[PDB]
Amino acid sequence: RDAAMQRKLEKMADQAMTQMYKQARSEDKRAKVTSAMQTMLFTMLRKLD
Amino acid sequence: VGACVLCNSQTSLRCGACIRRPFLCCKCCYDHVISTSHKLVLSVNPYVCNAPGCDVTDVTQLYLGGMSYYCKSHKPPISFPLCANGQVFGLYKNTCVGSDNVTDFNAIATCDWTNAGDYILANTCTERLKLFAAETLKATEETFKLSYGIATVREVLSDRELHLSWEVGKPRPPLNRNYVFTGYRVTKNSKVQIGEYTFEKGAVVYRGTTTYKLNVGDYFVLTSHTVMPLSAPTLVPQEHYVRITGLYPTLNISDEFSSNVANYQKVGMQKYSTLQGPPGTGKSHFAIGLALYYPSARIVYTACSHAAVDALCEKALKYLPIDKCSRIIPAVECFDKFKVNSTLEQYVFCTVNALPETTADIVVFDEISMATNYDLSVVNARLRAKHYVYIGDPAQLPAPRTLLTKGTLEPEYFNSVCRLMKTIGPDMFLGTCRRCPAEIVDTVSALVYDNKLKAHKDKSAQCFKMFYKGVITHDVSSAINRPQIGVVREFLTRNPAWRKAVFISPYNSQNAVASKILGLPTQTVDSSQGSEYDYVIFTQTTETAHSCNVNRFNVAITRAKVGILCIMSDRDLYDKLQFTSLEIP
Amino acid sequence: VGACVLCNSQTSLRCGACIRRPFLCCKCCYDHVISTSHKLVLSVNPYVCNAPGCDVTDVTQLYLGGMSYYCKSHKPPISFPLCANGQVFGLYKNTCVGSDNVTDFNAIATCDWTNAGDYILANTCTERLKLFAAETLKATEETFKLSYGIATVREVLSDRELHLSWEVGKPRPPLNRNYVFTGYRVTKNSKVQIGEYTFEKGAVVYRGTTTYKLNVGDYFVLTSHTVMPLSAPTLVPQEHYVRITGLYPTLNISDEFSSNVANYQKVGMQKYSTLQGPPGTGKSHFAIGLALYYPSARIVYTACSHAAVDALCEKALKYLPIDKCSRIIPAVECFDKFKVNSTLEQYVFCTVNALPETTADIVVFDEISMATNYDLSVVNARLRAKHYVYIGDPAQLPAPRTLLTKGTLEPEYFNSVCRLMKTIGPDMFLGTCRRCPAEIVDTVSALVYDNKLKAHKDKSAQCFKMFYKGVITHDVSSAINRPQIGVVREFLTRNPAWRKAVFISPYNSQNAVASKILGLPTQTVDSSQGSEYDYVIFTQTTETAHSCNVNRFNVAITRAKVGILCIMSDRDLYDKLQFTSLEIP
Amino acid sequence: LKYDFTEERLKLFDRYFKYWDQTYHPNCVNCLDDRCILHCANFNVLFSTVFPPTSFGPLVRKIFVDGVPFVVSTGYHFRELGVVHNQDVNLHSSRLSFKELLVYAADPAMHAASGNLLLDKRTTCFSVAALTNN
Ligand SMILES: [Zn+2]
Ligand SMILES: [Zn+2]
Ligand SMILES: [Zn+2]
Ligand SMILES: [Zn+2]
Ligand SMILES: [Zn+2]
Ligand SMILES: [Zn+2]
Ligand SMILES: [Zn+2]
C-alpha cells in the first residue's frame, strides 16, 4: 500500500488535470465565438439604418 | 488562463483573496498562499469545498475528492491534498519555475497602501510588479471612494448653495475639487443623468459644470469605474540609433524654436527622451515646435486631463493648421475647436482616458508628473510610437494620494518616468523661464533645479515675504488662519495697487473665508499648474507637510511673472527665499 | 511515404530538424538522429508527445502508449519504447537494410555550406546524396537571401537614382546585379507588381528592366521560391551504340560544318557526349550544326538563362527555318522571334527553368558551367532525350556561390559532367578560336587548356600587359584601385583610337567610378560571356582569388578578338601571360 | 404597413358564416384549449388567402441598445394563428448576454433588413431578399 495506492493517486490527479484543461479550452472557444458574433452584428447593422 | 506575473510561465491559478486576482504559477502561487493571508485561489474553478453547507475557503484544508475539492470532514475514502509537495494544484505543474524572491509580491499584495513605504515598494519593484501595484492602487482607491456616504440634497437654499444630508455608517469625503461627485436624478423607475459635481462648505456650496436646477431628493456619489488590466510597460526599452529614423529634416527654421530644434535632433534620433521642464519654459511651445520641426510626422498631444491638453490646444489654434488637428472627447466641456472623433488625423489631441489605440511618429505626454505608472503605461498600451517625448517635471505637483497617510512621496518615486531623470538625468532642458522674474527663478534654481534655470529679465522687486507666525484652528478637511487673513487685507488697505492679485491658498476653504471678507478670486495650489497671473497673493497658512513642501509650493511661487505676496509662517523655506520682508503692523 | 535516400527501402520516417526533411529508413533514421543534431522525426503522424502543454521533440525519449507517442513523464503504465533495439519504430522495419556508414549523410545534413569542403562532399558522393545536397544548398541560400534587410526607397532624387533605407537588425545584400531584387507596389490592401531591379551605388542607382516610375513607400525584396524535390539523375547511363541510333544521316555537307560533322557521328553514336568548348569557337554554331546535320531531328535549345539561349536564338534566325522554331518564356524581355508556348514544335528554345516535360531527339545544353547539379538533373526530369550534348566547359565561369566563404572550389568539382571532363576527357573539341588572335589563344591554351587551343589568324600585337603595385581601398560590396584609375586615362590619351574600347571590371562599382572619369561602357566579368568586343580593356584591381584566379580571368581575356588591355597588378599570371609590357607612366 | 386585419376577419365571418354559433377568435392567443385552437385556425386558414402576402411574417421593431438602434423581431403574424406578440421585450437594453447574442444572430430580421432586394423569376415562391451580390 506504499507503492500501490500511490500508483492510483497519480492516475486520478492526471485525469483531473486533463478534464480541467478541456474545460478551460471550452471556455476560451466560447470567448472567441462571442467576440465574432458581436462584431458580425455590429458590422452588419451599419449598412441598413 | 495566462502567464504568471512573477515567472511569466503560463498558469491557471489566480489569487482569489487578492485584490486584482493576478495570474500565479504553481510554485509561485504556492509561495504567495504560504507567505500571505490570501488563502483563496481561483483556478478554472474556484477552490472551495463544493459539498452543500460548507464554508472552508483555505487552500490547505481542501483535498481532491472525486471531481470536486473536499475538506477533511467532507472527503470520500479516496483523497489527495491539493496543497502538497510545496506546489498548489494547477495547470502546467511541470512547466513551472517558481520565484526565488516572493516576499516583494506578498508585501505588495497584502499592502494596504497606507504609508510612504508602500509607494517606495511600488517604484522599486519591477515592471509587471509596479504595473500590478498601480492597478491595485487605483482599484483600492475607486472602491474606497464608493465606500463613503451618499450626498443627499434634502432642501434647496438658493443659487450655488444647498443643504446636504449624508448616509449613516460611513464618513464624509473632503470638500475640495480633488474628488469629483456624480449625481443621478431619481425617478419612479431609476436614477440617471444629473452630472459631475464638487461640494464645499457654505450650508454647502456646490460646484457644477453645466447649468442645472437642483431639487429635493437628488443625491451625489463618488462614482467609480471598472479598472481594466494593463498590458504595456511604463516605458519602451531605450535604443540610441545612428540618425533621425523615419523623419525628414526641416528646410528652414523659426527663431522662437531655434533653441527648440537643437534639442529636437537627439529626440528624433533616440527612442524616448524625458523632459526637464520647469513651469512655463515653453514646454507647450516645445511640443508645438516639433510639428514646425516635422510637419509631416503625426504627433499625439496627451495629458492626464483635458485642461492640461488644452495647453497643447491653446497653441494649436495659432501655430498648427486646424484642418489637420483633432480633439477626442467621449460621449465635460472643454476645447472643441477641432473635429471630434477623427482618428486618422495628422494632429490628434486627447486625454489619457479616451485616446484610441493607434500609432504615431512621436508622442508628447504633457504633465508626466500628474499621471502615475497606471496612465504612464496606458499610452504604450494605446499607441506604440517610433519616438517619445514626456513633457513635465518631477519637480512639479504629484497626484493627490488619498490613501497616503504616513510620509510624503518623494519626487523621484512618483512614477517610472519620474525616477530616472534624477539618476541618469534629463536628455534636454529649457533654461528660458518665460514668466518668473529674477527674484523667483534664482530662488527655485538653487532649490531643486541645480542652479540651472536662469533669470529672464530683471529683479522686479515686486515679490515679498513676511516673517510671520500665524494661528490655525482646523475643521474636518481644512484649516484657516485668522491672523493671516487679517494681515493680507491690512497690507492691501494702504497699497491698493495690490487689489488685482489673486489670493492663493493650499486649503481652498481658507480663501473662501478670505473671499467673503475680501472678494478676490481663489487659487487651488494642487491645481494652479498651467494658470498664471502677474499679481498674486498667498498666505502660507500651515507649516505642516501638507502645505510647505518645497516642491508642492514651488508651483504657486512660479505663478507670478512680475510679483507675488507670501506671508510665511514657515521658517524652513523662509530662510532660503530671497524676497523682501517688510514691517508687521 | 517513399523510399529512403541511402537505402531505397520503403519507409515513412522523415527527418524533422533536417533541412529538406528526407525520407528516413528506420534503422538508417536512427543512425541519422544519433549521429546528427536532427532529433525530430515525423511519420504519417508526427512523433511528438501529444499530451497537452509539452515541448519535447527528441525521438529517443518518446515512448508508445496505445495509439500515440509519449515522453517519459507523460506515459500511461502500458508503454512501448519507440527508441529501442537501435531501431526507431517505423513503416517497413524488417524490409530494411540500413547503412554501415552514414556519417557522409550526417555531414551533408549538418552542413551550413561554408567551406569548399562542403561542395567537395556534395560532388564526391553518389546520385541520391548529391541531389539532396544540391537541394539543401539551394533552399538554404534561398532562406538566407530573404534573411537580409528590405530595400525601401524613401526619397526620389532623379532618373535612375534613388535614396534607399533598410530594415533594422538585418544586414544589407551586395551592390551588384548578382542578386536581382523584386519589389511590388504597396497599396492600402497589399503590395503588388513593381518588378525585378538591381541596386548599385550612385544615393543609389536602380537598374530596372522595363520603364517605371518609382515613388516613396515602394520597397524591394529578394523574392524566394520553393525548391521542389528533384527526381532524375544529372546524367543518364552511358551506352556506346554500334550504329547511328534514331537519326538519318545527311546527304550533302556545308564547308562551315565540315569541322562539325567530323565530330557529329560520335554525338549520335552514343547516349551522351561531352564538349571541350573554348570561348568564341562556334559552340552555338556547333549546336546549330546538328539541325543542318539532321533536318528531321527535334532538338531543344537549353541554357541557364534566356540571354544564353538568345545566343542559340541568335544563330537560329539565320540558318534555322523560322517556320519550325519556338521560344518558351514564362509569364522579362528577350528574343521572341519565334512563337511562344508551343510544346509541339521541332526547334524549341527555352531556359532550363521553364521548358515543360517532353521528349527530345537530341538535346543541346548551352553553358554547362554555371548550371550546377540542380539544373543538371532538372533537364533529365523534363526530357528523356534520346541523345545528349553538353555545350560548355569546366574551364568557364561557374555560378557565383553566395554561401562559399573559405577555400576556392575546384574547376572540376562544379558538377558531374564537368568532373568527368577532367578524368576521362571531353569527347569533342573545336580547334579554331573564331575571335581571339594568336596573342590570346596561345596564352590561354597553356593555362588550363593543356596547350590544345591553337591560333586562328595572326599575332596582332595589340594585347598589352603592365607591371604595377597599386593600393586598394574597399567598401561594402566593392573595391576600387585608384592608381589603376589614374593609369587607365593616362594610357589612353596618347592614342585617340583606343577610346572605342570597353572597360572590363571585376568589381563593377570600381568601373562605375571609372565610367564617371572616362565614360567608356561597363562590363561585368562574371557575366561577360556571350558578349565579345574587338577593342576591350581591363584593370586587374585585386590579385585575390575572387578576381584573377586562373579560370575566372580566361573569359575576360578572351573577350577581345584583336587586342586587349589589362594592367597586371599581380604576378601569378603576369609572368605566364605572353603579352607586351610597356613603361609605366 | 397595415398588418392587423382583425376587423376584416370578423366582418367576413359575419357576412358568410353569421349563424355558426361557436365563438370565433380572430387571434388564437385568446383560445381556451387545443380544440378551440383547431376551430379558429381552420377559419383563419380560409380568411388569410384574401389579404396580401407581403404583410405576413415577423413584425420587427426598432430597438435601442447601448445607444444604437437595432431591428429585432417582436412578434409574428401567421396565416393560421393570427397575431402573436412577444411578452418579454426590453427596449433600451444596456448589454447583451450570450443568450441575447444567440437569439439576435438567428433572427432573419437583421439579416434581410440589410440586404439587396431580389426578384426571382425562376420560382413562384415568394422571394424576400439577397444577402450577397451574386
Ligand atoms: Zn494575493
Ligand atoms: Zn510564478
Ligand atoms: Zn466541506
Ligand atoms: Zn536530417
Ligand atoms: Zn535507410
Ligand atoms: Zn510529454
Ligand atoms: Zn378560439
Side-chain angles (χ1 to χ4, degrees), chain A, chain B residues 1-26 28-92 94-99 102-159 161-176 178-184 186-187 189-206 208 210-212 214-383 385-515 517-582 584-585, chain C residues 1-26 28-92 94-99 102-159 161-176 178-184 186-187 189-206 208 210-212 214-383 385-515 517-582 584-585, chain D:
Chain A
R1 300 146 189 85
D2 220 317
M5 296 321 93
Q6 297 61 24
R7 256 80 167 241
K8 99 163 52 53
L9 303 183
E10 304 326 279
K11 80 62 181 166
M12 184 217 54
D14 283 28
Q15 62 148 323
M17 261 216 193
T18 61
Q19 96 84 42
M20 105 176 166
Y21 221 105
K22 158 218 80 44
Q23 176 270 0
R25 303 320 71 201
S26 88
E27 172 270 353
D28 273 287
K29 280 207 304 218
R30 158 204 186 96
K32 273 73 81 173
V33 309
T34 298
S35 174
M37 261 169 18
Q38 72 76 11
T39 191
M40 158 287 257
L41 260 64
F42 277 120
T43 200
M44 105 187 308
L45 82 90
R46 277 185 254 88
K47 296 217 305 295
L48 62 98
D49 201 292
Chain B
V1 172
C4 93
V5 278
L6 289 87
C7 318
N8 310 16
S9 42
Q10 68 290 333
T11 175
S12 157
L13 282 173
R14 273 177 277 96
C15 169
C18 205
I19 314 105
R20 292 242 63 173
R21 294 150 271 290
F23 281 123
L24 291 166
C25 76
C26 328
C28 187
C29 172
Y30 182 86
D31 305 338
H32 175 90
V33 80
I34 67 109
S35 179
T36 66
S37 176
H38 292 160
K39 306 293 208 315
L40 284 72
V41 299
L42 303 196
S43 162
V44 307
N45 300 317
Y47 274 141
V48 286
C49 184
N50 274 26
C54 211
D55 74 325
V56 185
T57 73
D58 170 64
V59 316
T60 312
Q61 306 328 298
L62 300 175
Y63 298 175
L64 269 283
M67 291 335 307
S68 311
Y69 333 112
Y70 284 170
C71 49
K72 64 209 52 43
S73 49
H74 294 213
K75 37 162 62 43
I78 221 67
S79 173
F80 182 26
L82 61 95
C83 186
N85 197 23
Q87 262 165 100
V88 279
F89 207 28
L91 278 199
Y92 333 117
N94 304 78
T95 86
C96 161
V97 305
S99 151
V102 79
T103 325
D104 46 272
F105 214 114
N106 307 308
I108 217 65
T110 74
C111 206
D112 279 89
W113 268 130
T114 50
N115 47 316
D118 323 292
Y119 307 84
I120 318 299
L121 204 57
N123 203 260
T124 45
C125 63
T126 188
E127 298 70 41
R128 164 55 43 208
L129 265 277
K130 68 165 49 55
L131 265 285
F132 179 69
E135 299 177 316
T136 46
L137 171 141
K138 292 274 220 302
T140 324
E141 157 59 350
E142 302 271 349
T143 314
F144 183 40
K145 297 329 282 168
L146 286 170
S147 323
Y148 280 175
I150 196 165
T152 48
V153 174
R154 233 77 189 179
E155 158 285 302
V156 191
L157 275 72
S158 167
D159 183 293
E161 274 211 9
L162 287 180
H163 194 304
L164 195 69
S165 180
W166 285 85
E167 213 155 7
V168 281
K170 44 198 155 91
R172 203 217 163 135
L175 299 323
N176 40 344
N178 304 100
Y179 314 150
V180 167
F181 277 85
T182 309
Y184 332 122
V186 197
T187 52
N189 263 325
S190 174
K191 76 204 74 180
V192 56
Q193 235 280 350
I194 281 193
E196 65 92 27
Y197 277 69
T198 309
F199 300 153
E200 202 211 56
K201 300 314 193 172
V204 292
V205 168
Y206 69 94
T210 69
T211 318
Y212 219 95
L214 284 174
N215 292 27
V216 278
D218 295 284
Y219 38 70
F220 310 74
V221 288
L222 296 324
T223 313
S224 307
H225 77 317
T226 88
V227 199
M228 60 320 296
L230 263 287
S231 36
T234 57
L235 280 92
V236 310
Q238 183 46 266
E239 218 282 338
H240 283 189
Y241 298 80
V242 52
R243 50 101 178 179
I244 301 138
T245 65
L247 308 168
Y248 325 94
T250 319
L251 281 189
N252 301 313
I253 207 143
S254 61
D255 64 82
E256 79 266 56
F257 302 107
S258 53
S259 315
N260 290 200
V261 162
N263 321 333
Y264 289 162
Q265 270 74 81
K266 162 260 308 166
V267 165
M269 171 294 308
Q270 88 153 305
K271 272 303 298 186
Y272 68 84
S273 270
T274 76
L275 166 138
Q276 205 83 349
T281 67
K283 297 149 65 133
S284 310
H285 304 99
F286 216 74
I288 289 323
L290 200 34
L292 284 87
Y293 191 53
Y294 291 144
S296 324
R298 77 276 316 285
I299 326 286
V300 48
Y301 301 83
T302 284
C304 174
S305 38
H306 257 292
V309 175
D310 189 8
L312 305 154
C313 305
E314 278 150 55
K315 325 205 156 44
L317 57 97
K318 35 151 185 149
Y319 268 93
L320 274 298
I322 304 310
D323 43 355
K324 338 157 69 186
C325 315
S326 283
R327 193 141 159 141
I328 312 306
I329 291 141
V332 280
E333 71 288 5
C334 268
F335 261 49
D336 277 300
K337 291 200 189 22
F338 320 138
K339 59 209 164 310
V340 79
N341 300 33
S342 165
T343 310
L344 72 181
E345 207 43 52
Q346 176 45 35
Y347 308 131
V348 284
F349 302 77
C350 183
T351 299
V352 307
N353 75 316
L355 186 91
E357 280 60 36
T358 86
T359 204
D361 282 303
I362 312 193
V363 317
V364 307
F365 214 80
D366 193 351
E367 191 55 25
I368 53 189
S369 44
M370 165 44 51
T372 88
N373 295 300
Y374 180 76
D375 314 279
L376 212 58
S377 86
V378 159
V379 83
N380 313 107
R382 294 151 278 188
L383 176 145
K386 151 190 58 52
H387 291 290
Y388 303 78
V389 164
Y390 314 115
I391 292 97
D393 217 32
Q396 285 208 340
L397 286 186
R401 281 87 185 226
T402 185
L403 275 294
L404 166 75
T405 50
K406 315 337 309 172
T408 319
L409 208 174
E410 267 43 71
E412 324 80 52
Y413 296 172
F414 288 162
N415 46 25
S416 296
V417 75
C418 278
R419 159 181 257 181
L420 87 164
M421 71 195 108
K422 298 140 296 298
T423 86
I424 314 114
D427 312 348
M428 82 305 297
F429 171 56
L430 256 53
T432 88
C433 215
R434 326 167 47 246
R435 320 85 46 80
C436 320
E439 284 222 341
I440 310 176
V441 185
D442 68 343
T443 311
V444 306
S445 67
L447 173 78
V448 70
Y449 285 157
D450 208 329
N451 298 266
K452 194 175 92 139
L453 190 80
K454 76 213 178 301
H456 207 123
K457 265 190 314 172
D458 44 19
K459 188 115 159 142
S460 305
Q462 250 283 334
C463 314
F464 300 98
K465 322 167 277 170
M466 214 167 304
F467 165 44
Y468 209 44
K469 294 331 249 177
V471 165
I472 288 300
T473 165
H474 59 324
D475 169 5
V476 165
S477 164
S478 197
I480 310 137
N481 37 4
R482 166 56 198 181
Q484 246 159 16
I485 303 273
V487 157
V488 50
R489 41 155 168 180
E490 180 117 357
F491 159 80
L492 301 163
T493 39
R494 282 121 69 158
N495 294 58
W498 277 85
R499 260 74 180 254
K500 271 168 93 203
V502 183
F503 212 169
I504 318 197
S505 55
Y507 283 142
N508 41 297
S509 179
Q510 175 245 45
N511 192 58
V513 186
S515 268
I517 310 309
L518 296 123
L520 309 100
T522 171
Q523 288 246 16
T524 39
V525 153
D526 226 11
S527 168
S528 65
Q529 303 206 286
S531 307
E532 77 298 340
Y533 297 94
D534 258 317
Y535 269 16
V536 283
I537 45 170
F538 194 17
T539 39
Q540 289 317 322
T541 324
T542 56
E543 56 270 340
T544 57
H546 148 280
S547 307
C548 301
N549 294 339
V550 304
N551 216 307
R552 196 222 162 199
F553 163 62
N554 215 58
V555 284
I557 185 173
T558 42
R559 300 310 88 195
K561 44 211 172 293
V562 81
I564 198 176
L565 165 87
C566 269
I567 299 112
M568 345 307 278
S569 88
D570 44 348
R571 187 49 155 287
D572 193 60
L573 193 66
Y574 165 85
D575 211 306
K576 162 262 195 156
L577 300 146
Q578 304 90 316
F579 287 176
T580 323
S581 208
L582 318 175
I584 293 192
Chain C
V1 171
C4 94
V5 52
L6 291 119
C7 309
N8 301 22
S9 35
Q10 286 189 325
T11 171
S12 156
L13 313 185
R14 267 181 277 96
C15 177
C18 195
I19 309 106
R20 291 232 64 175
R21 185 181 332 305
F23 283 129
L24 266 189
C25 165
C26 318
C28 165
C29 158
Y30 185 77
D31 313 338
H32 186 37
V33 56
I34 65 109
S35 177
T36 66
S37 86
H38 303 169
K39 325 192 181 57
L40 169 69
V41 297
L42 294 85
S43 159
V44 191
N45 301 316
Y47 281 173
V48 178
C49 180
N50 61 331
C54 214
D55 184 328
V56 283
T57 87
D58 162 67
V59 50
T60 74
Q61 74 208 123
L62 309 183
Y63 298 164
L64 165 64
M67 271 55 58
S68 305
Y69 326 116
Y70 287 132
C71 58
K72 191 42 216 80
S73 76
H74 290 214
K75 314 143 49 210
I78 291 95
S79 62
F80 188 0
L82 306 158
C83 191
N85 302 334
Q87 173 203 303
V88 177
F89 192 68
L91 259 165
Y92 317 125
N94 301 73
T95 69
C96 191
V97 301
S99 154
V102 197
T103 323
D104 42 358
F105 209 42
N106 295 141
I108 289 198
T110 50
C111 211
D112 280 273
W113 305 106
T114 82
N115 40 312
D118 316 317
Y119 302 83
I120 294 159
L121 208 54
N123 187 253
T124 42
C125 199
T126 83
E127 168 50 35
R128 305 101 173 183
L129 307 90
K130 183 189 73 39
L131 267 276
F132 179 68
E135 303 210 16
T136 53
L137 67 101
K138 292 296 171 329
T140 315
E141 64 201 78
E142 206 67 50
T143 317
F144 305 130
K145 283 320 288 186
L146 257 191
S147 157
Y148 277 57
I150 214 165
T152 199
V153 173
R154 238 72 193 177
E155 283 157 33
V156 197
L157 272 68
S158 44
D159 183 18
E161 277 216 11
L162 283 177
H163 165 209
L164 86 175
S165 179
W166 289 84
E167 254 178 14
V168 283
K170 323 207 308 171
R172 206 210 161 173
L175 272 285
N176 216 331
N178 37 26
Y179 321 102
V180 183
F181 275 82
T182 311
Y184 322 150
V186 190
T187 323
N189 261 322
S190 175
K191 106 170 310 197
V192 316
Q193 64 79 53
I194 278 186
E196 42 98 6
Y197 284 62
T198 83
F199 300 151
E200 64 267 25
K201 158 151 212 305
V204 81
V205 168
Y206 69 97
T210 179
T211 320
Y212 216 96
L214 294 171
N215 295 30
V216 306
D218 292 288
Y219 41 85
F220 299 71
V221 310
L222 301 163
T223 308
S224 78
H225 75 316
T226 59
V227 188
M228 53 41 60
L230 277 196
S231 64
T234 51
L235 61 107
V236 302
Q238 177 53 273
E239 192 39 60
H240 173 280
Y241 300 81
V242 76
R243 279 262 306 127
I244 299 139
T245 57
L247 262 302
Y248 329 96
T250 319
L251 279 186
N252 295 311
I253 206 144
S254 148
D255 49 42
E256 309 180 49
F257 286 144
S258 54
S259 313
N260 283 206
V261 164
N263 323 129
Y264 275 172
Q265 330 94 36
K266 47 158 172 202
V267 174
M269 265 327 305
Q270 73 171 306
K271 252 296 155 176
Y272 85 88
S273 268
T274 68
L275 277 292
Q276 174 39 261
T281 67
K283 314 152 301 283
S284 309
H285 150 282
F286 211 46
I288 293 318
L290 315 161
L292 287 87
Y293 188 51
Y294 284 111
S296 323
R298 190 204 146 284
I299 89 164
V300 277
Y301 301 78
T302 41
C304 37
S305 38
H306 310 73
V309 177
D310 189 11
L312 306 158
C313 302
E314 170 264 320
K315 259 146 185 61
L317 61 93
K318 32 198 71 159
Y319 321 109
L320 279 291
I322 323 300
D323 304 25
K324 261 183 298 161
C325 317
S326 280
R327 182 125 160 140
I328 315 305
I329 274 188
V332 280
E333 101 272 20
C334 264
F335 258 32
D336 265 347
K337 289 201 189 22
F338 320 138
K339 73 192 147 57
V340 80
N341 296 33
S342 166
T343 310
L344 59 165
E345 207 44 52
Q346 189 70 349
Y347 313 135
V348 185
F349 304 75
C350 185
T351 305
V352 298
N353 75 317
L355 153 76
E357 278 56 40
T358 87
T359 178
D361 278 297
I362 170 155
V363 79
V364 306
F365 203 123
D366 190 352
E367 201 145 26
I368 66 185
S369 48
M370 334 160 84
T372 193
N373 294 300
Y374 176 70
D375 263 306
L376 218 64
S377 152
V378 159
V379 301
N380 307 105
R382 325 171 303 177
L383 41 61
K386 155 63 191 93
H387 292 284
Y388 207 133
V389 195
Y390 277 91
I391 293 95
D393 216 37
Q396 185 219 25
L397 288 193
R401 284 98 184 240
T402 194
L403 307 191
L404 170 52
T405 322
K406 69 209 185 271
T408 320
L409 193 293
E410 285 272 8
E412 42 271 40
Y413 291 167
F414 292 165
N415 49 24
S416 295
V417 65
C418 284
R419 202 287 316 283
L420 82 80
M421 275 185 178
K422 271 22 190 184
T423 77
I424 209 63
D427 312 343
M428 271 65 88
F429 170 48
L430 255 54
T432 204
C433 207
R434 277 151 209 194
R435 75 169 92 101
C436 321
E439 210 161 28
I440 308 178
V441 186
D442 179 27
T443 322
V444 306
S445 49
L447 178 81
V448 72
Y449 288 159
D450 160 49
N451 294 267
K452 157 202 224 167
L453 264 293
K454 292 332 199 166
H456 202 128
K457 304 88 159 183
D458 275 350
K459 182 116 154 143
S460 306
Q462 245 279 336
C463 315
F464 306 102
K465 69 193 206 284
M466 188 177 295
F467 41 72
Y468 207 36
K469 287 334 253 177
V471 191
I472 193 46
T473 167
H474 62 327
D475 303 355
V476 48
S477 166
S478 169
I480 310 135
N481 216 36
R482 179 242 166 190
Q484 255 189 335
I485 303 277
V487 161
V488 52
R489 207 225 95 199
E490 181 120 358
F491 156 83
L492 301 158
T493 55
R494 273 121 81 160
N495 227 312
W498 268 88
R499 259 151 197 71
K500 321 185 187 321
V502 182
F503 209 169
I504 271 180
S505 59
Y507 292 148
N508 80 326
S509 179
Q510 178 237 42
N511 189 57
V513 188
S515 268
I517 303 310
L518 299 120
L520 317 177
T522 171
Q523 289 244 16
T524 323
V525 180
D526 194 37
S527 169
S528 66
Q529 41 275 37
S531 307
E532 33 253 65
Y533 296 93
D534 222 351
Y535 263 21
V536 77
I537 85 156
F538 194 16
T539 48
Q540 183 214 304
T541 285
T542 53
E543 52 270 338
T544 55
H546 317 306
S547 175
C548 205
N549 60 312
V550 293
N551 194 249
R552 312 303 184 260
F553 175 59
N554 215 58
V555 280
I557 182 177
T558 40
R559 293 308 88 199
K561 37 199 161 281
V562 156
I564 193 180
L565 160 69
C566 173
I567 298 108
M568 328 306 154
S569 198
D570 65 357
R571 282 165 98 137
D572 197 60
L573 280 207
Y574 161 88
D575 281 29
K576 312 311 297 163
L577 257 165
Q578 324 280 359
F579 281 1
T580 323
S581 277
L582 301 104
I584 172 58
Chain D
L1 312 110
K2 185 182 132 83
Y3 62 86
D4 210 352
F5 305 129
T6 308
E7 315 87 357
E8 281 79 55
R9 299 182 154 126
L10 279 159
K11 194 38 172 141
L12 277 156
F13 182 87
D14 273 47
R15 211 216 307 286
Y16 293 125
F17 290 99
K18 194 158 75 146
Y19 279 82
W20 186 253
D21 70 327
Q22 191 173 314
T23 82
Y24 153 68
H25 314 100
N27 315 321
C28 287
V29 78
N30 321 322
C31 280
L32 326 167
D33 40 328
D34 50 3
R35 308 176 104 227
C36 194
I37 291 197
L38 288 186
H39 162 281
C40 303
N42 183 50
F43 285 117
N44 283 14
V45 161
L46 174 68
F47 300 155
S48 34
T49 68
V50 180
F51 312 135
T54 72
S55 74
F56 295 112
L59 328 172
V60 305
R61 177 204 318 256
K62 177 143 77 30
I63 274 177
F64 274 130
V65 64
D66 44 10
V68 159
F70 279 19
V71 169
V72 306
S73 159
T74 83
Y76 213 93
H77 185 357
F78 321 93
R79 329 177 114 97
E80 330 94 353
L81 306 170
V83 202
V84 162
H85 269 295
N86 273 358
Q87 264 183 20
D88 298 334
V89 69
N90 67 0
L91 93 175
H92 318 53
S93 189
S94 164
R95 278 280 310 107
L96 311 96
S97 323
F98 201 56
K99 162 197 164 189
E100 290 336 284
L101 279 196
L102 256 64
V103 306
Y104 286 2
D107 288 2
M110 172 36 78
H111 291 278
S114 73
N116 319 329
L117 187 43
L118 158 83
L119 165 63
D120 199 321
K121 320 296 279 314
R122 297 181 288 171
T123 86
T124 88
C125 312
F126 184 79
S127 152
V128 166
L131 311 146
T132 49
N133 279 320
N134 34 24

